[PDB]
Ligand binder design. Structure first.
Ligand code: MG
Ligand code: MG
Ligand code: MG
Lengths: 190, 99, 99, 109, 139, 201
RNA sequence: CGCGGAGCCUCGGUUGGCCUCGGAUAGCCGGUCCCGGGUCCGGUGCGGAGUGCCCUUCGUCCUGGGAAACGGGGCGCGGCCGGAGAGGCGGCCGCCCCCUCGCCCGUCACGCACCGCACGUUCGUGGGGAACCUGGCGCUAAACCAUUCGUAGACGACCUGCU
């Protein structure tokens, strides 16, 4: 079984004008621009319309494993389109039982530093990805508010600072301390 | 002696077993020797030479770095010198490369 | 190694290094070489050998020697050494070394 | 003027894996790499021209020091070019990987 | 990407096999590898061919799948495929490629003299065109 | 045929190119393989690295200075695969193996000569595109080759001298095409003879 | 420095060249208008093509017509420039100097035309080794031993010194 054709189309709003340089999607919107190549996948990308501009992607004689990469491309393109019109925003709370975790942001949101995690002296310093700007909230008492265009960089920067606050050599069913991603939202809430 | 120089198999003496031969005169590079003093040589200044390069600001004696009778098997040090902490490779009069 | 340039006046304690028997030699080392520092057709060869060394080389090393006549030792033959020059660009560390 | 013979490589002798028969040589003619392409060459004279120390006689000239071992291309060998050739005396093993001339004598064109 | 498609009516060019060099038309598709295939005006009777033998052209005929011989013959004849072919560059390249092969020893001589002269004029002319482009004296 | 055979190494699979080379070297045929960092190996990277690290453990434990010599440049890894396809204990295979010159990058005897490509040994011909492969230049770097940075800086310098050559060569090609329109009333006789006999479509 | 000559000895292979984009492969290549790009126009079973391209070699004399005339030829001199990854190579100029021949198509005849027959044809003034004549321009050393040293040492080796 190899399926003759499996396609999936993506609707593009009027804010963003994507281009196709082969298998490279350059999405360009109000919040900046983005770029990924999909040259590790054999698909054909084509812009369709003249007024609405869909984006199809076809596979042509794929087996089952190749047929899964079609909708992932569509999902990455849709996270590009959401990223350059709404943008990504992760709010993450700092959970502590006794020792208040003190986060102070270093140079222009590129570096955070974490002081008092489980009452110890070593200072965590974890650098954000290029493009992700972290911040300390004013809505609540202690949550970080980091945001950016690309989803795989905003999410990686939350994962670096969550794995920076790991409890070692203790039971982690008590000792629930750390900074954990509390919600995965957007800027410019539609 | 070394009593056993290998098992039956491998039917050969390995390169890792201690054997007799040359000791010393090997090139060696040792690190992290701290400089304690860069000493100044004998210079002739006002007709008579100032020779106090082993003086401190706590000793103030007019003595050179030379011990009485000179350095044994070497001679006397009239030039600039370096005072390193500890021991370094080679005999006396050995040329040392210090980087 | 790309290109080597020597100075015009090398002293006898350094020229003694190039011989195994100084006493039987005619002391002829670097004698046809030194005349191209006082030439014109050989002079222009020297600054082509600096400027090509300025535009190709990445590592510069100066060739220096000790001066054994300040030492109380029996040896008169000096020790040559290549000591490399760190810091700056290659053109910057080259005309430093020519001074 | 001009080359006027077609150039071939002496590959080896007719052999099995652990036996070789030195009376039949195997040639690779440059240009032909299929068995249907090799019918042109199937009667052609062929020579192994080499030089030695002493002078020998030359038919049509003064004594050179070139010597020739003459042969014929007899049949095809395999599926890709590769004729096999029968020489008057067997080729020395020094010749393996050197030039053998293929001559265009007896013609059928 | 992908301007030429296997479909019913697509005219292909058979590249090897026994019917090598013949235009032919795709009548129906079998099992991803083979195609029912008919050349009514190129002496290829209806049969099965693997897709690796055939090379797609730009020509498409209009008939439904698995029609008989006469409906692909008359679709061939109007919008005449035999004369649109041998006007494309691709049929001209094939025509030139075999008449170079069937070139005798004397015709190789006449071409050799002609090309040797023709490259004298062109080489002489490019000497003049690049010394006239060399006459440039502006900062 | 007395010239050498210059093969670009890039894009070629290691053991498919090696059987092509080893049969040519035994038939006479001087051959030079340049740019051996571009040689590919099929299977994903970590798999092929383990096969080299498993090779790095075979050493004569009595005296490893006698042992298998584990060459670590990409040119000398390729040189041992073609040696394994040669009868190198005989005089014929030793006289083969010095008809073969292997290079990392493209040295200045061979940078101004046009390279050949063996299509029966290419990655785009011999692998399915959804199969993982590796690079001989990368894999040699993790096993101890000192010089992929200096070889990359000398390949990017070679290519920018080669771009200048191309756009001047291509600048003469449009002067020659310009000439063929200037002189066409005086070569129309000769472009008919060439067009009749299969030249000049 | 010469091919400058004369001969040798010895090792043999070889039988025209290709003087360079980088890469992509579910895409490439080539031209072009406006600020290396966007446009636009072509090509794509690669024809601006290695399934390719370039050189072509009977020699001359009579004699015409085309191509040419900004040319050809000189190990011609003189200068300049490029190239370092193994540059061992590639250019551009100035003056002299000969040739209007060499490239195509034609007139015109001639050359041992050696009497059917093989190793012919190149690279090539090949590599290597001795000896000789002819010219110019040059050049005038070390190493080892003996000796001394003791930073070294079984012995050799090593480190040293000597108007
Ligand atoms: Mg515990
Ligand atoms: Mg010969
Ligand atoms: Mg090592």
């Amino acid at each position: 079984m190899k399926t003759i054709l499996s396609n999936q189309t993506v609707d593009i709003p009027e804010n963003v004008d994507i281009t196709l340089k082969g298998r490279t999607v350059i999405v360009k919107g109000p919040r900046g621009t983005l770029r990924r190549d999909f040259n590790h996948i054999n698909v054909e990308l084509s812009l369709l319309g003249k007024k609405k501009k869909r984006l199809r992607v076809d596979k042509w004689w794929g087996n089952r494993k190749e047929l899964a990469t079609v909708r992932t491309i569509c999902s990455h393109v849709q996270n590009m389109i959401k990223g350059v019109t709404l943008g990504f925003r992760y709010k993450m709370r700092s959970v502590y039982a006794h020792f208040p975790i003190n986060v102070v942001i270093q140079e222009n949101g590129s570096l955070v530093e974490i002081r008092n995690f489980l009452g110890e002296k070593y200072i965590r310093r974890v650098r954000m990805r290029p493009g992700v700007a972290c911040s300390v909230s004013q809505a609540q008492k202690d949550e970080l508010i980091l945001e950016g265009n690309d989803i795989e960089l905003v999410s990686n920067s939350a994962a670096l600072i969550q794995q920076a606050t790991t409890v070692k050599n203790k039971d982690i069913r008590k000792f629930l301390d750390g900074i954990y991603v509390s919600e995965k939202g957007t800027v410019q809430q539609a | 002696k070394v009593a056993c120089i290998g098992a039956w198999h491998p039917a050969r003496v390995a390169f890792s077993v201690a054997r007799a031969g040359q000791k010393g005169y090997h090139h060696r590079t040792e690190i992290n020797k701290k400089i304690y003093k860069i000493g100044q040589g004998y210079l002739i200044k006002d007709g008579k030479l100032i020779k106090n390069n082993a003086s401190t600001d706590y000793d103030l004696s007019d003595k050179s770095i030379n011990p009485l009778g000179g350095f044994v098997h070497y001679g006397e040090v009239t030039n600039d010198f370096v005072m390193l902490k500890g021991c370094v490779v080679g005999t006396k009069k050995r040329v040392l490369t210090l980087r | 190694t790309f290109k080597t340039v020597f100075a015009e006046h090398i002293s006898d304690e350094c020229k003694r290094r190039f011989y195994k028997n100084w006493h039987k030699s005619k002391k002829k080392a670097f004698t046809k070489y030194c005349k191209k520092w006082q030439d014109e057709d050989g002079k222009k060869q020297l600054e082509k050998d600096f400027s090509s060394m300025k535009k190709y080389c990445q590592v510069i090393r100066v060739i220096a020697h000790t001066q054994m006549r300040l030492l109380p030792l029996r040896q008169k033959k000096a020790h040559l050494m290549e000591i490399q020059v760190n810091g700056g660009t290659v053109a910057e560390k080259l005309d430093w070394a020519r001074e | 003027s001009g080359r006027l013979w077609s150039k071939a490589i002496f590959a080896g002798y007719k052999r099995g894996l652990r036996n070789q028969r030195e009376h039949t040589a195997l040639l690779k003619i440059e240009g032909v790499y299929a068995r249907d392409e090799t019918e042109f060459y199937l009667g052609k004279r062929c020579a192994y021209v080499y030089k030695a120390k002493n002078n020998t006689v030359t038919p049509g000239g003064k004594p050179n020091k070139t010597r020739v071992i003459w042969g014929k291309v007899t049949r095809a060998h395999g599926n890709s070019g590769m004729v096999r050739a029968k020489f008057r005396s067997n080729l020395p093993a020094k010749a393996i990987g050197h030039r053998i001339r293929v001559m265009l004598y007896p013609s059928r064109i | 990407v992908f301007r030429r498609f296997v479909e019913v009516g697509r005219v292909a060019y058979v590249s090897f096999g026994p019917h090598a060099g013949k235009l032919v038309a795709i009548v129906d598709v079998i099992d991803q590898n083979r195609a029912l295939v008919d050349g009514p005006c190129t002496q290829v009777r209806r049969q099965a061919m693997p897709f690796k033998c055939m090379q797609l052209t730009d020509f498409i005929l209009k008939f439904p799948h698995s029609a008989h011989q006469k409906y692909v013959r008359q679709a061939w004849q109007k919008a005449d495929i035999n004369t649109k072919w041998a006007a494309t560059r691709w049929a001209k390249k094939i025509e030139a490629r075999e008449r170079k092969a069937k070139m005798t020893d004397f015709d190789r001589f006449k071409v050799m003299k002609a090309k040797k002269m023709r490259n004298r004029i062109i080489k002489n002319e490019v000497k003049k065109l690049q010394k006239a482009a060399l006459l440039k004296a502006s900062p | 045929e007395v010239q050498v055979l210059v093969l670009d190494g890039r894009g070629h699979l290691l053991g498919r190119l090696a059987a092509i080379v080893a049969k040519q070297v035994l038939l006479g045929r001087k051959v030079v393989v340049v740019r051996c960092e571009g040689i590919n190996i099929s299977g994903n990277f970590y798999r092929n690295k383990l096969k080299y690290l498993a090779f790095l453990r075979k050493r004569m434990n009595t005296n490893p200075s006698r042992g298998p010599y584990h060459f670590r440049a990409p040119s000398r890894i390729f040189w041992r695969t073609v040696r394994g396809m040669l009868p190198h204990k005989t005089k014929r295979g030793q006289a083969a193996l010095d008809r073969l010159k292997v290079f990392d990058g493209i040295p200045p005897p061979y940078d101004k000569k046009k390279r050949m490509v063996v299509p029966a040994a290419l990655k785009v011909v011999r692998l399915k595109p959804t199969r993982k492969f590796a690079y001989l230049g990368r894999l040699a770097h993790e096993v101890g080759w000192k010089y992929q940075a200096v070889t990359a800086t000398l390949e990017e310098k070679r290519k920018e001298k080669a771009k200048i050559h191309y756009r001047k060569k291509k600048q003469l090609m449009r002067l020659r095409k310009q000439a063929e329109k200037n002189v066409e009333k005086k070569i129309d006789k000769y472009t008919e003879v060439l067009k009749t006999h299969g030249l000049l479509v």
